[PDB]
């Protein structure tokens, strides 16, 4: 909701409360999943061509008791945009791989989980410096590209580590070294095609015998297709990763091949059914695991939009993984999940 | 404060800062108690009859040093309301027993503590699905009823528990199995009369030898009366509970009888003195405790309203509990407390 | 940003996102330092002479992974102001010493660090009761004074302590006993001169073998000068402390002498270069340390203001401390730092 617009500065204060419940035999996910998000998007006109902006978004869990608080920053960045030349921002933001993989990240509740957060340049993460160019300097409508750098996020400070430390250090599964990435998308009428590549130095803490998927760099190669016209939405993405896809708690996949596809239809009266399939196939994983499915599920659901501020949904995760030694070892969910949600937003 | 109202959506952003200090011989409550609350209530018009809404409220303590953060979510829910039929909402909300007991929870600082938060269906808690009918299809002015369900909130995940786990699990004093409850209130002119009932399954983690008050289910039965007119506020509530009332850290009371009464007057010049009495009498407690007072105090206080946005208050808790073995074991406060508060709100 | 002004009540919702990166050989400070702040300031007109107000300010780090949250309350207080008589507020707030020392806390990133937070009455802290008078009861334009009390903030409750506990207790380095302080400042045309004194009881937890600088009270004496006109900003402050200045993790300085001076110029086109010198010198530190430099650096930087809502800066801390056993023992940084920041604010 635009709560301020005066003297060249605008502030949008936005958010949502999602009253959400999961039903599953996996009791680690089963039960109340209520959460809220809150954010702001501000923009200031410096000149006719130059605009400044800032964006921040925060999630606060609404399913805990009052003696605990589970909350986190999703994004937090500041930037400058110059008409027909480009934009630059720095902060906690999305990796440029998500420019393409976000196209299938449209399910009512599930989806978008062949990758995670703080997972190299694949989704949300710290220390992204991002250049974006829309419509190729204004010369080619629908052609967008982006170039991105991510600074190292290493070992925790003040804990006796003698190398690889950064001020904002963390556990090895969420670390990264210096990284570079780029994306390109082209949309013409209903159709969209896109590609993205990222390459990040892996840290010394990540490359130990404690974790599968050792290697000098974490790399991803992604291609995507889209159709978004005439009340239909179709999308698919394929990603091949090296030492980049997490395998539960075990570390990373030496190689993974990830695939997501989605089909949706929007009825005039507000109902939007959705069908999706997601898989992540791990190769040469190590420790005698050889090849294993990391993720495999069909998703069927629907959202009903009352209007722009209110919706409700059902989502059914049909989990095709089987309970075996590998999934137990990695802590990967193999159970079905049904989610029921009622969402107010502003 | 309403900060947005446009095209049928409204957003109220509200909060307060309470500069607050306790004086007590009990050093665990003595000192700075400063805090703030923030919240939003949003509503969106779907049709002339149907409205969607959401509410979120958060408390952040203002009395800690900067190397820590003590904050929590009070409520977080989304809902639908249909004109002359009813409403439904889901999330963290108040239990329906509070429809009646809230009537005496009107003291400047203290009060409202014959029960607590995350305490079956008695006050705030997770996973409430709440159905409400106001004015009986608009055919009986002032008559309201509600029926409520609470889903299980069990053992924490990822801690080696082999049963009773939920995604949002917690310590046993704040757990609950599935519950159902209901409330009826009638208000004619200044007068009010009300009743409520709740029945919750108790979890296995709650029914161990480590806690007093073992039982299959927690039940509560409440009656209340109110008078609110001519600058006079009077209210009283009586509640009988079974395996539902906490006895400090010891567990729960096999049976408890709770009573609260308040008298308040509003002077034209802004002063509102308040007198209250609360007691909770436990019976058949176990471990040789037998019958014991869980709570017993007289509260005398006053609030001065400068206007609807600024006020100051003093509240004096004259604590009639005596220091004995039982209160020592349970960690129940037996000392008096004086609170002094200065409050800005919007 | 003023988001509400209606019927005598006013609310300013303000904040900023600082996309920020440090470059340093010290890996404990090196890396992404992105953060955001959010706050509100509210005021209500009670009469033509009396105004009520509240303020709250919060910082949320934007440089961490989503599995943790590093945030805190900077300030949270409520108060009343009566025209030509004075103001009183209570809560988490700034010590009156900062009335004078704030005059040199104007550097683009560094500065303000011969003292810290929760550091007796020197900067932000809990339980301050503060009286202020502007223009000496309206009789002397530009003459301001302040008198302040801070309540004890002691040992944590529930941790087995038998004396010195408060409800909001914390670690010894952030404790304080009861304190009193005052400041006076006179400002006329470009110029300013001012003084402040504070005296706090130190707690028993602070006077143990674990900490250097044992003593009965923490005392500070500060003088300061300022010129602020004709696009020029000059300021200097000198403070003499006893058992009040922290020496990294080691405890406090029996005696310290602190000095800060700054010179800035504002070019019409938006650039504001800055030069500063800071030092803190400890004497009779004990434990064989004798006299030692606690802090010593020159700061050269510049901020470029695109407008009132957008800015960017570079700040270069040239650290004149040498690495020795003392700085290593204390965890005090001796390496240079370059900070680069891009800031959106509203
Ligand atoms: C008592 C304060 C007087 C100090 C004023 C400084 C005068 C220098 C010109
Ligand atoms: C009472 C506040 C004014 C304090 C003036 C003393 C300044 C000390 C300088 C060393
Ligand atoms: C009131 C004392 C002013 C002098 C301060 C000197 C600053 C260095
Ligand atoms: C001109 C500033 C002098 C600094 C010396 C402090 C002792
Ligand atoms: C590091 C250079 C700072 C020197 C500034 C001295 C200003 C004196 C205060 C005059 C008022
Ligand atoms: C620019 C000001 C430098 C101040 C250095 C003071 C050191 C005093 C030594 C005794
Ligand atoms: C602009 C970044 C260059 C890095 C220089 C490092 C200096 C250490 C402090
Ligand atoms: Cl222009
Ligand atoms: Cl937290
Ligand atoms: Mg399965
Ligand atoms: Mg007593
Ligand atoms: Mg040095």
PDB file of N, CA and C in Angstrom, chain C residues 168-228:
ATOM      1  N   UNK C 168      15.623  -7.371  34.134  1.00  0.00           N
ATOM      2  CA  UNK C 168      16.191  -7.180  32.796  1.00  0.00           C
ATOM      3  C   UNK C 168      17.713  -7.304  32.803  1.00  0.00           C
ATOM      4  N   UNK C 169      18.228  -8.166  33.672  1.00  0.00           N
ATOM      5  CA  UNK C 169      19.657  -8.269  33.892  1.00  0.00           C
ATOM      6  C   UNK C 169      20.439  -8.818  32.718  1.00  0.00           C
ATOM      7  N   UNK C 170      21.752  -8.582  32.737  1.00  0.00           N
ATOM      8  CA  UNK C 170      22.619  -8.888  31.610  1.00  0.00           C
ATOM      9  C   UNK C 170      24.059  -9.123  32.084  1.00  0.00           C
ATOM     10  N   UNK C 171      24.942  -9.399  31.125  1.00  0.00           N
ATOM     11  CA  UNK C 171      26.377  -9.588  31.384  1.00  0.00           C
ATOM     12  C   UNK C 171      27.026  -8.332  31.980  1.00  0.00           C
ATOM     13  N   UNK C 172      28.060  -8.548  32.792  1.00  0.00           N
ATOM     14  CA  UNK C 172      28.702  -7.491  33.577  1.00  0.00           C
ATOM     15  C   UNK C 172      29.133  -6.275  32.762  1.00  0.00           C
ATOM     16  N   UNK C 173      29.651  -6.497  31.556  1.00  0.00           N
ATOM     17  CA  UNK C 173      30.116  -5.379  30.709  1.00  0.00           C
ATOM     18  C   UNK C 173      28.999  -4.422  30.313  1.00  0.00           C
ATOM     19  N   UNK C 174      27.751  -4.876  30.412  1.00  0.00           N
ATOM     20  CA  UNK C 174      26.601  -4.037  30.057  1.00  0.00           C
ATOM     21  C   UNK C 174      25.696  -3.731  31.249  1.00  0.00           C
ATOM     22  N   UNK C 175      26.157  -4.048  32.457  1.00  0.00           N
ATOM     23  CA  UNK C 175      25.451  -3.651  33.669  1.00  0.00           C
ATOM     24  C   UNK C 175      25.777  -2.204  34.058  1.00  0.00           C
ATOM     25  N   UNK C 176      24.974  -1.674  34.971  1.00  0.00           N
ATOM     26  CA  UNK C 176      25.220  -0.388  35.612  1.00  0.00           C
ATOM     27  C   UNK C 176      24.448  -0.342  36.926  1.00  0.00           C
ATOM     28  N   UNK C 177      24.970   0.379  37.904  1.00  0.00           N
ATOM     29  CA  UNK C 177      24.199   0.724  39.096  1.00  0.00           C
ATOM     30  C   UNK C 177      23.425   2.012  38.850  1.00  0.00           C
ATOM     31  N   UNK C 178      22.838   2.559  39.912  1.00  0.00           N
ATOM     32  CA  UNK C 178      22.109   3.828  39.809  1.00  0.00           C
ATOM     33  C   UNK C 178      23.083   4.932  39.439  1.00  0.00           C
ATOM     34  N   UNK C 179      22.685   5.766  38.483  1.00  0.00           N
ATOM     35  CA  UNK C 179      23.515   6.861  38.021  1.00  0.00           C
ATOM     36  C   UNK C 179      22.767   8.173  37.886  1.00  0.00           C
ATOM     37  N   UNK C 180      23.526   9.256  37.953  1.00  0.00           N
ATOM     38  CA  UNK C 180      22.992  10.598  37.767  1.00  0.00           C
ATOM     39  C   UNK C 180      23.955  11.373  36.885  1.00  0.00           C
ATOM     40  N   UNK C 181      23.410  12.224  36.034  1.00  0.00           N
ATOM     41  CA  UNK C 181      24.225  13.015  35.123  1.00  0.00           C
ATOM     42  C   UNK C 181      23.515  14.274  34.693  1.00  0.00           C
ATOM     43  N   UNK C 182      24.262  15.150  34.050  1.00  0.00           N
ATOM     44  CA  UNK C 182      23.729  16.415  33.593  1.00  0.00           C
ATOM     45  C   UNK C 182      24.553  16.945  32.459  1.00  0.00           C
ATOM     46  N   UNK C 183      23.947  17.811  31.636  1.00  0.00           N
ATOM     47  CA  UNK C 183      24.657  18.497  30.557  1.00  0.00           C
ATOM     48  C   UNK C 183      24.199  19.946  30.433  1.00  0.00           C
ATOM     49  N   UNK C 184      25.077  20.782  29.882  1.00  0.00           N
ATOM     50  CA  UNK C 184      24.714  22.163  29.520  1.00  0.00           C
ATOM     51  C   UNK C 184      25.326  22.472  28.159  1.00  0.00           C
ATOM     52  N   UNK C 185      24.550  23.101  27.276  1.00  0.00           N
ATOM     53  CA  UNK C 185      25.062  23.527  25.969  1.00  0.00           C
ATOM     54  C   UNK C 185      24.533  24.923  25.659  1.00  0.00           C
ATOM     55  N   UNK C 186      25.398  25.784  25.117  1.00  0.00           N
ATOM     56  CA  UNK C 186      24.986  27.080  24.591  1.00  0.00           C
ATOM     57  C   UNK C 186      25.354  27.189  23.111  1.00  0.00           C
ATOM     58  N   UNK C 187      24.383  27.564  22.284  1.00  0.00           N
ATOM     59  CA  UNK C 187      24.575  27.630  20.842  1.00  0.00           C
ATOM     60  C   UNK C 187      24.150  29.035  20.421  1.00  0.00           C
ATOM     61  N   UNK C 188      25.005  29.719  19.674  1.00  0.00           N
ATOM     62  CA  UNK C 188      24.697  31.068  19.225  1.00  0.00           C
ATOM     63  C   UNK C 188      25.393  31.343  17.907  1.00  0.00           C
ATOM     64  N   UNK C 189      24.594  31.704  16.907  1.00  0.00           N
ATOM     65  CA  UNK C 189      25.070  31.872  15.540  1.00  0.00           C
ATOM     66  C   UNK C 189      25.745  30.551  15.156  1.00  0.00           C
ATOM     67  N   UNK C 190      26.838  30.563  14.411  1.00  0.00           N
ATOM     68  CA  UNK C 190      27.452  29.259  14.052  1.00  0.00           C
ATOM     69  C   UNK C 190      27.920  28.347  15.198  1.00  0.00           C
ATOM     70  N   UNK C 191      28.144  28.916  16.382  1.00  0.00           N
ATOM     71  CA  UNK C 191      29.029  28.314  17.394  1.00  0.00           C
ATOM     72  C   UNK C 191      28.332  27.597  18.554  1.00  0.00           C
ATOM     73  N   UNK C 192      29.039  26.655  19.165  1.00  0.00           N
ATOM     74  CA  UNK C 192      28.519  25.923  20.315  1.00  0.00           C
ATOM     75  C   UNK C 192      29.613  25.538  21.303  1.00  0.00           C
ATOM     76  N   UNK C 193      29.269  25.560  22.584  1.00  0.00           N
ATOM     77  CA  UNK C 193      30.162  25.102  23.652  1.00  0.00           C
ATOM     78  C   UNK C 193      29.291  24.379  24.658  1.00  0.00           C
ATOM     79  N   UNK C 194      29.822  23.331  25.283  1.00  0.00           N
ATOM     80  CA  UNK C 194      29.005  22.531  26.178  1.00  0.00           C
ATOM     81  C   UNK C 194      29.810  21.652  27.095  1.00  0.00           C
ATOM     82  N   UNK C 195      29.156  21.157  28.145  1.00  0.00           N
ATOM     83  CA  UNK C 195      29.798  20.250  29.102  1.00  0.00           C
ATOM     84  C   UNK C 195      28.806  19.236  29.620  1.00  0.00           C
ATOM     85  N   UNK C 196      29.335  18.111  30.074  1.00  0.00           N
ATOM     86  CA  UNK C 196      28.528  17.062  30.668  1.00  0.00           C
ATOM     87  C   UNK C 196      29.336  16.316  31.723  1.00  0.00           C
ATOM     88  N   UNK C 197      28.641  15.884  32.775  1.00  0.00           N
ATOM     89  CA  UNK C 197      29.216  15.046  33.833  1.00  0.00           C
ATOM     90  C   UNK C 197      28.253  13.892  34.131  1.00  0.00           C
ATOM     91  N   UNK C 198      28.792  12.698  34.352  1.00  0.00           N
ATOM     92  CA  UNK C 198      27.975  11.570  34.785  1.00  0.00           C
ATOM     93  C   UNK C 198      28.704  10.785  35.862  1.00  0.00           C
ATOM     94  N   UNK C 199      27.915  10.186  36.741  1.00  0.00           N
ATOM     95  CA  UNK C 199      28.441   9.401  37.838  1.00  0.00           C
ATOM     96  C   UNK C 199      27.521   8.223  38.124  1.00  0.00           C
ATOM     97  N   UNK C 200      28.003   6.998  37.860  1.00  0.00           N
ATOM     98  CA  UNK C 200      27.251   5.777  38.085  1.00  0.00           C
ATOM     99  C   UNK C 200      27.914   4.845  39.091  1.00  0.00           C
ATOM    100  N   UNK C 201      27.101   4.273  39.961  1.00  0.00           N
ATOM    101  CA  UNK C 201      27.521   3.174  40.804  1.00  0.00           C
ATOM    102  C   UNK C 201      27.831   1.984  39.901  1.00  0.00           C
ATOM    103  N   UNK C 202      28.953   1.324  40.153  1.00  0.00           N
ATOM    104  CA  UNK C 202      29.313   0.094  39.443  1.00  0.00           C
ATOM    105  C   UNK C 202      28.795  -1.099  40.252  1.00  0.00           C
ATOM    106  N   UNK C 203      28.433  -2.178  39.567  1.00  0.00           N
ATOM    107  CA  UNK C 203      27.876  -3.346  40.250  1.00  0.00           C
ATOM    108  C   UNK C 203      28.965  -4.309  40.714  1.00  0.00           C
ATOM    109  N   UNK C 204      28.608  -5.182  41.657  1.00  0.00           N
ATOM    110  CA  UNK C 204      29.526  -6.192  42.174  1.00  0.00           C
ATOM    111  C   UNK C 204      30.045  -7.115  41.071  1.00  0.00           C
ATOM    112  N   UNK C 205      29.175  -7.461  40.131  1.00  0.00           N
ATOM    113  CA  UNK C 205      29.553  -8.297  38.990  1.00  0.00           C
ATOM    114  C   UNK C 205      30.650  -7.650  38.129  1.00  0.00           C
ATOM    115  N   UNK C 206      30.734  -6.321  38.153  1.00  0.00           N
ATOM    116  CA  UNK C 206      31.737  -5.607  37.384  1.00  0.00           C
ATOM    117  C   UNK C 206      33.079  -5.580  38.126  1.00  0.00           C
ATOM    118  N   UNK C 207      33.044  -5.748  39.447  1.00  0.00           N
ATOM    119  CA  UNK C 207      34.234  -5.689  40.267  1.00  0.00           C
ATOM    120  C   UNK C 207      34.661  -7.094  40.707  1.00  0.00           C
ATOM    121  N   UNK C 208      35.117  -7.883  39.735  1.00  0.00           N
ATOM    122  CA  UNK C 208      35.612  -9.228  39.973  1.00  0.00           C
ATOM    123  C   UNK C 208      36.936  -9.423  39.244  1.00  0.00           C
ATOM    124  N   UNK C 209      37.579 -10.555  39.524  1.00  0.00           N
ATOM    125  CA  UNK C 209      38.857 -10.910  38.917  1.00  0.00           C
ATOM    126  C   UNK C 209      38.802 -10.981  37.396  1.00  0.00           C
ATOM    127  N   UNK C 210      37.616 -11.220  36.846  1.00  0.00           N
ATOM    128  CA  UNK C 210      37.448 -11.314  35.402  1.00  0.00           C
ATOM    129  C   UNK C 210      37.694 -10.009  34.652  1.00  0.00           C
ATOM    130  N   UNK C 211      37.633  -8.862  35.343  1.00  0.00           N
ATOM    131  CA  UNK C 211      37.678  -7.548  34.678  1.00  0.00           C
ATOM    132  C   UNK C 211      38.711  -6.623  35.308  1.00  0.00           C
ATOM    133  N   UNK C 212      39.543  -6.003  34.474  1.00  0.00           N
ATOM    134  CA  UNK C 212      40.401  -4.910  34.924  1.00  0.00           C
ATOM    135  C   UNK C 212      39.528  -3.685  35.190  1.00  0.00           C
ATOM    136  N   UNK C 213      40.079  -2.706  35.903  1.00  0.00           N
ATOM    137  CA  UNK C 213      39.361  -1.460  36.173  1.00  0.00           C
ATOM    138  C   UNK C 213      38.313  -1.555  37.259  1.00  0.00           C
ATOM    139  N   UNK C 214      38.584  -2.330  38.308  1.00  0.00           N
ATOM    140  CA  UNK C 214      37.658  -2.386  39.453  1.00  0.00           C
ATOM    141  C   UNK C 214      37.549  -1.003  40.116  1.00  0.00           C
ATOM    142  N   UNK C 215      36.359  -0.667  40.597  1.00  0.00           N
ATOM    143  CA  UNK C 215      36.145   0.602  41.276  1.00  0.00           C
ATOM    144  C   UNK C 215      34.718   0.818  41.733  1.00  0.00           C
ATOM    145  N   UNK C 216      34.531   1.735  42.679  1.00  0.00           N
ATOM    146  CA  UNK C 216      33.208   1.987  43.262  1.00  0.00           C
ATOM    147  C   UNK C 216      32.228   2.595  42.253  1.00  0.00           C
ATOM    148  N   UNK C 217      32.684   3.607  41.518  1.00  0.00           N
ATOM    149  CA  UNK C 217      31.807   4.348  40.598  1.00  0.00           C
ATOM    150  C   UNK C 217      32.447   4.563  39.231  1.00  0.00           C
ATOM    151  N   UNK C 218      31.605   4.719  38.216  1.00  0.00           N
ATOM    152  CA  UNK C 218      32.024   5.078  36.869  1.00  0.00           C
ATOM    153  C   UNK C 218      31.704   6.558  36.694  1.00  0.00           C
ATOM    154  N   UNK C 219      32.731   7.362  36.426  1.00  0.00           N
ATOM    155  CA  UNK C 219      32.603   8.823  36.301  1.00  0.00           C
ATOM    156  C   UNK C 219      33.152   9.318  34.964  1.00  0.00           C
ATOM    157  N   UNK C 220      32.474  10.316  34.390  1.00  0.00           N
ATOM    158  CA  UNK C 220      32.859  10.906  33.110  1.00  0.00           C
ATOM    159  C   UNK C 220      32.714  12.438  33.190  1.00  0.00           C
ATOM    160  N   UNK C 221      33.673  13.139  32.592  1.00  0.00           N
ATOM    161  CA  UNK C 221      33.693  14.602  32.517  1.00  0.00           C
ATOM    162  C   UNK C 221      34.049  14.990  31.097  1.00  0.00           C
ATOM    163  N   UNK C 222      33.160  15.756  30.451  1.00  0.00           N
ATOM    164  CA  UNK C 222      33.243  16.032  29.029  1.00  0.00           C
ATOM    165  C   UNK C 222      33.095  17.524  28.748  1.00  0.00           C
ATOM    166  N   UNK C 223      33.945  18.037  27.862  1.00  0.00           N
ATOM    167  CA  UNK C 223      33.787  19.376  27.299  1.00  0.00           C
ATOM    168  C   UNK C 223      33.825  19.254  25.795  1.00  0.00           C
ATOM    169  N   UNK C 224      33.155  20.173  25.115  1.00  0.00           N
ATOM    170  CA  UNK C 224      33.033  20.123  23.668  1.00  0.00           C
ATOM    171  C   UNK C 224      32.816  21.497  23.068  1.00  0.00           C
ATOM    172  N   UNK C 225      33.190  21.616  21.796  1.00  0.00           N
ATOM    173  CA  UNK C 225      33.088  22.860  21.034  1.00  0.00           C
ATOM    174  C   UNK C 225      32.629  22.490  19.645  1.00  0.00           C
ATOM    175  N   UNK C 226      31.914  23.403  18.998  1.00  0.00           N
ATOM    176  CA  UNK C 226      31.352  23.158  17.691  1.00  0.00           C
ATOM    177  C   UNK C 226      31.212  24.484  16.929  1.00  0.00           C
ATOM    178  N   UNK C 227      31.439  24.429  15.618  1.00  0.00           N
ATOM    179  CA  UNK C 227      31.029  25.494  14.685  1.00  0.00           C
ATOM    180  C   UNK C 227      30.287  24.850  13.519  1.00  0.00           C
ATOM    181  N   UNK C 228      29.097  25.360  13.202  1.00  0.00           N
ATOM    182  CA  UNK C 228      28.207  24.746  12.215  1.00  0.00           C
ATOM    183  C   UNK C 228      27.537  25.873  11.426  1.00  0.00           C
TER     184      UNK C 228
END
